[PDB]
Amino acid sequence: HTLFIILALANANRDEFLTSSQLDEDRTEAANRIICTIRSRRPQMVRSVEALCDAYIILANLDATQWKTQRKGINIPADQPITKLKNLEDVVVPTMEIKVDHTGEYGNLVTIQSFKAEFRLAGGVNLPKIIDCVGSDGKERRQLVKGRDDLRQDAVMQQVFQMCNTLLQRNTETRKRKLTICTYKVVPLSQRSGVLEWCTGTVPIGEFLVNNEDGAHKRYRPNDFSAFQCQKKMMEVQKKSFEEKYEVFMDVCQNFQPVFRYFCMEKFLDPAIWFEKRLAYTRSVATSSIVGYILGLGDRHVQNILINEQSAELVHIDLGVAFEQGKILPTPETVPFRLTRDIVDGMGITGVEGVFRRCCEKTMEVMRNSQETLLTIVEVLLYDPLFDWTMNPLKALYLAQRPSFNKVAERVLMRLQEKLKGVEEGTVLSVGGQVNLLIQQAIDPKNLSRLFPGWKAWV
């Protein structure tokens, strides 16, 4: 549970080696000392894990821009050292979640056996590589290797999500309702490259809804406006008045009816299973929305939300934007979370009323009852020297592109404390009142109109 973190700290500048302030060199030297101390008694494990990390970094540094149009699978070049390594009985799979035991002895763990020779590519600005890892048991595992990006923030967000899950588990009101946050393992390897868990059996909600070829909206409502038409209309009114934006958004919403409720109908024909999946989806949406509001999660567009095909549970990815840094963006986010028409339509005929509202109230009560622990955790995060959570102009422009630290941290902590105590506009609001206010703000068409077209508020 610690070797990969220390190696990642010690391999901050190995990206250019394979291909600032004194604190960086001091941290690197201390990490090297820890690595030598670990290698003193168990050298084979340290050497094998270091070789695996070097192989991952080399694979990440591969350009592979020629196969952008290929989606069938490209054979890994024989020059990559990842192919040479096989049967690493001393390396546990970083993708898998390793259970923690009180005893120091670790046994019967799934170790890396070999890697498949074929790798896939995912859409995006940069090209990440999807590789398959075969464990000791012989079960394949899919791993996503990302380059030119920082993955430590994602790992920290996953840790906070794990803490939220543990807080929700120990309360009987949320344990009965099985309110959990879907999490995936993130293993940073350097300051520029890293590897993280690939959620098998999950599809983006935007891919399912507004796909150009076989989207849900096109399949179920051929006579309505296409996704491209709505996107173009929203981009046209971008440099216009607020009233014009509002009336354009209303016109688009009039000719764009939600069809997301059909996911459970076409995937779960049994009424009992369909009801179970719909209830699980509603509970997952309510819990994720409350957690995101508490942590100030932003940039929750269609491509950043994944839905499990088997369990119908939402999975949130790309957690770089948090602590209300999305409001500081050139196009501020006026919604605490994503509660668009598709999201409400997928909850059933009752909509936000019923399971969603009660689950949101229970989650907010749990958050309020554990305000001290959450505040302490956020204080621990905010003073991390390597946690680059503050918004910068480069990140602001990259997020929205078209064709004193102590004072900020204290302000963020005060805002979080006000959220945990129910203070919104200087007044004390109950759990039910706060939940109602958040639902109203999320479903308000006026707030959705101001949002960036890339966020796809109408979707």
């Binding site: 009965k176 179920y220 179970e276 059933g348």
Partner: protein
């Protein structure tokens, strides 16, 4: 044949023999065959029981397995906690809920059969061993044959799947006692196997291993020319089916109705598939076969439909049948289920035209609101919910198309068009489902109605508001008016008030309906009103308690057996689709089992070890119920308190009743803690009063005083709780001199709680609070050197 390798597996899985001298050698042989690998844990025993279940559907043969499972559940309750924890990640396939479902299915199969009482008693005892444990699931799932599903997946053509289904059904019914049915099945098997489709099925299905292939070998024959099914062209194929009387005879004769409908479909010329035409002799002798084949016949007719004439005819006849159901006429619960199964089967079929699942849901032009209402009447809650959602979506799409509406408006249009309110129907559907959160989704309908308000108050445990509304409103029927009044009074304590109210009600009214007798017996046994003296649950419990007092054990066991059998029989006739419907039954069976278990202790001598073991078992099983609702745990605690008080009021000349007094005090403290957790204040106060009846105040204070202080704190009475705790601290300081290890934990907890309460109330400066309570508790817990304990470790950690 123990050494036979091919027979060893099936010998291992057979049910154990009855406990008798004659079955000795076979018993040891079976136990050593089964336990050859090694001892079996509770999970392994449950898995073995479930694997045995799928073999023979005869409840009489499973009596010994039921008793063995009861024994394992009784003496392996520790492993049940681990079993439940292991199923937390995936509660859908929990082994415990699967076992409960299998036991209930076995009880249903035992209905109307010889020796059913023993099977029902054994099942009730097994469900009494495991109580209403929160399974973290809402919908009951039924076990499905994996091999059958794989065989269905083997064939891609729909006709091949139909052939496989019919051949499997014929093979299954070939072992029936009826000889005409066997002859018809053999003739149909030969006819199907002689066709080209049967040959293609045999070629595709011969790769897999299945005994049905060997069973069908003699019937199959090799011929140069394939069997040809004659095709006749009727002048008007629609005249046979275009009859409203034919579709709805409904003369309380479902068998002849389904037989005539199947025959009329068969004689129609619309059918194109060859295998369906040869099923007439088998259909004419079995109604179940007709019900099974009817969806396939309808699908085959609709596939060959031209100009939508058959689709329109079937749509209007099915709609007329559903309207005749809605009416008030008085149809048989089998015809409605058959039509619901027909609709469900047709909903899963892909239409010939390219489309989505929503288009596939409308093979026939049907009003799904009526079908949902029928399904709700047939207790198909999830099916009714899905049909209601489909109807709402279809009507919204139709309105949008016509124009080129909220829930209340859509319900108003539904009422003004078909006479059925969508919001009301969704209300009863969600109430039947029983999921607490879904009740708030559809609440806009009948908001001002007193019944809805009272149900909301009862769901939210607003017993005072419910009592006020029950007393205020009068137009509500009396039987449920006093039923709610009594329930609200009992949930708030008020035992004397409830008893006087019952006496006055009996004085003013001579007629006595069973509900009021049930509530009167419940209050009589709960309040220990022993002078009040088919049989119902609480009446049986009261009779058993009096038999226990009078040492009439034979009638005590007979009454408990009758109550268990009645509870199981009442649970058998329910829908068995919602998990929440099992919790009251499981709680009642647990209470019956606990009373039966304490009966043997009462009968024989009273010893400290037996009482300690019984209390430990009760505490462990209560911990197994930590996620259960308070409504399912409160009756168990009340029965335990009544049992303990009955044990104490027994003549006790051995002067060792202090053990029972301590056990009752601990039980009442635990009950107070549980009620405090569920935001209840009347029950903890009653428990404190009951403790104070049997206890007093001495130099050495006890835990129930701290529990009373906590209860007073929960009642928003901070001054009283602080004064009580300060008096407790002063008495502890004056009494103990670091000499009593037992008082160490009480002193530390009292100091810590008082310091926390003072800090919360801001009634003292931090310096004095630290000097007097917190650091004092830490010093008491640490410097006393009363180490080597776990409770001390927990107290030190909390301090």
């Amino acid at each position: 044949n123990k050494d036979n390798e091919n027979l060893y597996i099936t010998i291992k899985l057979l049910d154990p023999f009855p406990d008798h001298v004659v079955f000795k050698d076979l018993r040891i042989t079976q136990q050593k065959i089964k336990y050859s690998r090694g001892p079996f844990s509770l999970l392994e025993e449950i898995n073995h029981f479930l694997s045995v279940s799928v073999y023979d559907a005869l409840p009489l043969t499973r009596l010994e397995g039921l008793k063995d499972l009861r024994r394992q559940l009784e003496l392996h309750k520790d492993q049940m906690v681990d079993i439940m924890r292991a199923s937390q990640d995936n509660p859908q396939d929990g082994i415990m809920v699967k076992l409960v479902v299998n036991l209930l299915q076995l009880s249903k199969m035992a209905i109307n059969h010889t020796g059913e009482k023993e099977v029902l008693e054994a099942v009730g005892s097994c469900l009494g061993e495991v109580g209403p444990i929160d399974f973290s699931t809402i919908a009951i799932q039924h076990s499905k044959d994996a091999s059958y599903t794989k065989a269905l997946k083997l064939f891609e053509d729909k006709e091949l799947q139909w052939t496989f289904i019919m051949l499997t059904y014929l093979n299954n019914t070939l072992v029936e006692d009826c000889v005409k049915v066997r002859s018809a099945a053999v003739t149909c098997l030969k006819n199907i196997l002689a066709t080209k489709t049967g040959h293609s099925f045999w070629e595709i299905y011969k790769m897999t291993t299945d005994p049905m292939l060997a069973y069908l070998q003699p019937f199959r024959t090799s011929r140069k020319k394939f069997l040809e099914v004659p095709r006749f062209d009727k002048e008007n194929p629609f005249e046979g089916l275009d009859d409203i009387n034919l579709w709805i005879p409904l003369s309380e004769n479902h068998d002849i109705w389904i037989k005539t409908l199947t025959c009329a479909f068969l004689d129609s010329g619309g059918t194109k598939c060859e295998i369906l035409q040869l099923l007439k002799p088998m259909c004419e002798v079995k109604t179940d076969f007709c019900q099974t084949v009817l969806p396939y016949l309808i699908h085959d007719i609709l596939l060959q439909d031209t100009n939508e004439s058959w689709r329109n005819l079937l749509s209007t006849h099915v709609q007329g049948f559903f309207t005749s159901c809605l009416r008030h006429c008085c149809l048989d619960k089998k015809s409605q289920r058959t039509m619901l199964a027909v609709v469900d089967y047709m909903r899963r079929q892909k239409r010939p035209s390219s489309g989505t699942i929503f288009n596939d849901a409308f093979w026939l032009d049907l009003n799904y609101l009526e079908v949902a209402k029928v399904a709700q009447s047939c207790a198909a809650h999830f099916t009714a919910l899905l049909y209601a959602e489909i109807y709402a979506d279809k009507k919204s799409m139709d309105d949008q198309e016509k124009r080129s509406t909220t829930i209340s408006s859509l319900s108003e249009k539904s009422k003004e068009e078909t006479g059925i309110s969508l919001q009301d129907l969704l209300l009863e559907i969600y109430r039947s489902i029983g999921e607490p959160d879904s009740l708030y989704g559809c609440g806009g309908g009948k908001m001002l109605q007193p019944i809805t308000r009272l149900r909301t108050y009862e769901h939210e445990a607003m017993w005072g508001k419910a009592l006020v509304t029950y007393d205020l409103e009068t137009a509500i029927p009396s039987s449920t008016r006093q039923a709610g009044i009594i329930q609200a009074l009992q949930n708030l304590g008020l035992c004397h008030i409830l008893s006087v109210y019952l006496k006055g009600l009996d004085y003013e009214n001579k007629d006595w309906c069973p509900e009021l007798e049930e509530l009167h017996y419940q209050a009589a046994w709960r309040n220990m009103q022993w002078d009040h003296c088919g049989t119902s649950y609480h009446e049986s419990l009261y009779n058993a308690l009096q038999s226990l007092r009078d040492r009439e054990f034979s009638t005590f066991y007979e009454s408990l057996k009758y109550a268990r059998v009645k509870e199981v029989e009442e649970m058998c006739k329910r829908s068995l689709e919602s998990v929440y419907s099992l919790y009251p039954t499981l709680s009642r069976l647990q209470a019956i089992g606990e009373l039966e278990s304490i009966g043997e202790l009462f009968s024989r001598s009273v010893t400290h070890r037996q009482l300690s073991e019984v209390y430990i078992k009760w505490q462990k099983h209560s911990q197994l119920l930590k996620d259960s609702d308070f409504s399912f745990q409160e009756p168990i605690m009340a029965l335990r308190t009544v049992i303990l008080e009955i044990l104490m009021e027994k003549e006790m000349d051995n002067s060792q009743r202090e053990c029972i007094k301590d056990i009752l005090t601990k039980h009442l403290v635990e009950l107070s803690i549980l009620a405090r957790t569920f935001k209840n204040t009347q029950l903890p106060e009653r428990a404190i009063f009951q403790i104070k009846q049997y206890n007093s105040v001495s130099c050495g204070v006890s835990e129930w005083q701290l529990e009373e202080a906590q209860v007073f704190w929960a009642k928003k009475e901070q001054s009283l709780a602080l004064s009580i705790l300060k008096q407790m601290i002063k008495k502890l300081d004056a009494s103990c001199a670091a000499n009593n290890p037992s008082l160490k934990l009480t002193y530390t907890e009292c100091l810590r709680v008082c310091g926390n309460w003072l800090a919360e109330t801001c009634l003292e400066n931090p310096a004095v609070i630290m000097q007097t309570y917190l650091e004092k508790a830490v010093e008491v817990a640490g410097n006393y050197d009363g180490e080597s304990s776990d409770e001390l470790r927990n107290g030190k950690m909390k301090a």
